Every structure is written in C-alpha cells, then in structure tokens.
Design a protein around this motif. Structure first.
Motif, short mmCIF file in Angstrom:
data_model
loop_
_atom_site.label_atom_id
_atom_site.label_comp_id
_atom_site.label_asym_id
_atom_site.label_seq_id
_atom_site.Cartn_x
_atom_site.Cartn_y
_atom_site.Cartn_z
N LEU A 166 -36.00 10.79 -71.86
CA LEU A 166 -36.12 9.35 -71.80
C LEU A 166 -35.92 8.66 -73.14
O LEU A 166 -35.36 7.58 -73.20
N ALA A 192 -44.39 7.17 -68.04
CA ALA A 192 -43.14 6.83 -68.68
C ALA A 192 -42.17 6.23 -67.71
O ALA A 192 -41.99 6.74 -66.59
N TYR A 193 -41.46 5.21 -68.14
CA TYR A 193 -40.67 4.45 -67.22
C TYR A 193 -39.38 4.02 -67.91
O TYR A 193 -39.42 3.72 -69.09
N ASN A 194 -38.24 4.05 -67.21
CA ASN A 194 -36.94 3.75 -67.86
C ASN A 194 -36.53 2.31 -67.76
O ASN A 194 -35.47 1.93 -68.29
N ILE A 248 -39.59 8.30 -63.02
CA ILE A 248 -39.41 7.59 -64.24
C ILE A 248 -38.47 6.43 -64.10
O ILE A 248 -38.44 5.58 -64.96
N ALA A 286 -44.12 1.41 -70.27
CA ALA A 286 -44.55 2.38 -69.27
C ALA A 286 -45.09 1.67 -68.05
O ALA A 286 -45.05 0.44 -67.98
N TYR A 323 -33.18 8.52 -58.50
CA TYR A 323 -33.24 8.33 -59.94
C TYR A 323 -32.21 7.34 -60.41
O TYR A 323 -31.06 7.65 -60.49
N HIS A 325 -39.07 15.23 -69.99
CA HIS A 325 -38.79 13.94 -69.36
C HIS A 325 -38.83 12.82 -70.36
O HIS A 325 -37.94 11.98 -70.38
N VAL A 326 -39.86 12.84 -71.20
CA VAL A 326 -40.02 11.82 -72.22
C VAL A 326 -38.96 11.92 -73.32
O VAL A 326 -38.39 10.90 -73.71
N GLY A 354 -45.95 11.98 -68.17
CA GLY A 354 -44.66 12.24 -67.59
C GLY A 354 -44.91 13.14 -66.40
O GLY A 354 -46.01 13.65 -66.21
#
Length: 279
Positions: free
Chosen positions: A233, A273-275, A13, A256, A23, A229-230, A203
């Motif tokens: 997030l 999903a991406y941070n 993510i 995302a 991470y 995770h989401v 995710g």
C-alpha cells in the motif's frame, strides 16, 4: 482498476467495509516504486511476479526460497493476482534461513544493505521495505530499522504473533517505523496479533492467500502477512504521488478506516489500512 474475486485482504484495503470481494485501485498500481522484502527470499520465477522480482542479496548459500514465506509476502506486496501493488519492483533480501530463523547480526546487515542498495535501484517514486519478521527486543535491530527508515525507505514491520504488547519485540517496538497489526476478515484484531501504543495500523493478517514456492499459492495467517499489505500500500501511494517514504506511515494512518476493528485493546489504534481509491 478492479480485480474481482480477489483475496479478501486486497479487497478490504480498497473498502470502507468488510465482506466485499473486489480490489479497487489505480492502474498505476505501483509502477516505479520498489519494495525490499526482507525475509527468506523470493521465487523470482513464479509467473505471478511477471519478472519483477529478483533476489538481490542473501547471507546464505542460496538465493532460492526454501521456505515460501518470503515468496508469500512478496506476492502480497506485488504479485499480479494476490498483491496490492501489481507493478512494483520487488527486491528480495534473504536474511532468514529455510526454517525461518535468523541471527540478528544478519538481519541488521540486511537492513543496512537496503539503505545502500536502494541507491543502486531505480525507484523514482520511492522505496519500501517489508520486514516480514521480528524477534524479542533488541536496540541493535531497532536502531537498524530506524536507520533504514531515516534513509528514505518506508519500513513496514510486523507487530508479531505473540498476542502481547509489541513494545517487547523488535523491530516492532522501534518508534520511527510502521508497525502493523493483523486483522481478520470480519474485522477483528486477529487472535494472535500483538498490540499496543507502538502499533500504527492494521492490515489483513488472517488466512491470507498469496504466492508460494513451487509456482503454487497458499493461504497462511500472521501479522507478517499483514506487513506486506501495508508495504504494498505504501508502494501504491508513493507511486500515486500521495506521499513520500518518510511520511507514508502517517499518511496511511490518517487515511485509514477509523474504529472498524473489534477486539482492539485499550491504548492501541483502531486503524485499518485503506487505499482511498474512488473508482
């Protein structure tokens, strides 16, 4: 921040690509958002939670988690080591017995509890609920997740592990919440993961390492291992000021990784999903 040899889910993510193991995230790390893990309960005494977890509600004799599944998911939300949002508060709501079953009657109470109990907790940055569960379709439960949502609580629900369209499952099929599919590490929709129009994001859901009852730590598969995770997030992103709770799904979805995943049936989104953290 940059946690090395992190779980693959966490490292994904923070990544545009598969196959890294670091991470990356802002060290704000969720400080001042809350997450309601609505599951089997949390072992608040796991050293990984650093005294940020409590059980606030249970519909059963005990607050204690006999299953581990809530503890697991709470870990992925916010354990110091396995969790997305390393400084979120965690709020356990045990709506599922130690064999993972729950009457819907109960579950719904659980949801309505959160939408009030959030007015007792200090979550300036915002509130999230990770519904690490679901069953067959029921508008009563759907509408509960919608009410919860409405109330200013970003709801992450699991799409389910039936490899079906997730319109037949609640509260996955509720339009108004963030339904999460599971991806595995080589960036495929996971074999078991539900799909459809009603999904909103994927995710990491396959072989996901996190905390477990008895101070231990295990790796288990499931879309309800992706949900957190989401949720994590969202709690990350609310704390960063990047979105409110009522828009978090749409924010996350817009930010995302597009068109990564394989084995994504036609009609389902290809969003992972991406941070978006640039380090």
């Amino acid at each position: 921040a940059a946690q090395t040899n992190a779980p693959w889910g966490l490292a994904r993510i923070s990544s545009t690509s598969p196959g890294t193991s670091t991470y990356y995230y802002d060290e704000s790390a969720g400080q001042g958002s809350c997450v309601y893990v609505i599951d089997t309960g949390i072992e608040a005494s796991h050293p990984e939670f650093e005294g940020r977890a409590q059980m606030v509600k249970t519909y059963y004799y005990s607050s204690r988690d006999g299953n581990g599944h809530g503890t697991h998911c709470a870990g992925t939300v916010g354990s110091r080591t396995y969790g997305v949002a390393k400084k979120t508060q965690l709020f356990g709501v045990k709506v599922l017995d130690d064999n993972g079953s729950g009457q819907y009657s109960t579950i719904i109470a659980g949801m309505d509890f959160v939408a009030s109990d959030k007015n007792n907790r200090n979550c300036p940055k915002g509130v999230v609920a990770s519904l690490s569960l679901g069953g067959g379709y029921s508008s009563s439960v759907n509408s509960a997740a919608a009410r919860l949502q409405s109330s200013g609580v970003m709801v992450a629900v699991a799409a389910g592990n039936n490899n079906a369209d997730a319109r037949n499952y609640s509260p996955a099929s509720e339009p108004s919440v963030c339904t999460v599919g599971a991806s595995d590490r080589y960036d495929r929709r996971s074999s078991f993961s539900n799909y459809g129009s009603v999904l909103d994001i994927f995710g990491p859901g396959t072989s996901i390492l996190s905390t477990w009852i008895g101070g231990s730590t295990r790796s288990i598969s499931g879309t309800s291992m992706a949900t957190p995770h989401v949720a994590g997030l969202a709690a990350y992103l609310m704390t960063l000021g990047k979105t409110t709770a009522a828009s978090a799904c749409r924010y996350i979805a817009d930010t995302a990784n597009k068109g990564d995943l394989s084995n994504i049936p036609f009609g389902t989104v290809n969003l992972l999903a991406y941070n978006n953290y640039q380090a």
